[PDB]
Chain A
Amino acid sequence: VRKMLMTLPALKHILPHGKLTTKIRSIGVNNSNQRRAGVIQKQVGAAVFFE
């Protein structure tokens, strides 16, 4: 969607005046069951951000 927005003619002139990135987040998941299986888990969220 970030590449779509850089292609998007709607924001054609707005984006060059700020920073268009993909923010990535990752927090720890408490899953006690998967811990016993040796599987530690993370929740990764990503969106297109504009500063």
Chain B
Amino acid sequence: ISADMQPQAQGKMLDMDEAIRQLEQALSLARSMAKAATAANATQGDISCQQRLNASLTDLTAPGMLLHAPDGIGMVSARALRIASGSESVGIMS
């Protein structure tokens, strides 16, 4: 699901160049901070699963969900919201 323009449908159905930049950049940030956490003797984040997610979501080589919007995403509700990973990590990169 993408708020990215592909004018006149010129391109692949799954052109996610900017979605991929966002995924690459987030994992790049997660990885630099994981090195910082090791140097500081903090607990390290799970880079392993966020690294498979980049693999899975890039061109959707595995059945995942990629939501990208160049101008921001809002997930709002009056009721409860759940972001849950059953077996792996949730990563909030910023």
Do A's and B's CB atoms come within 8 Å in the complex? no
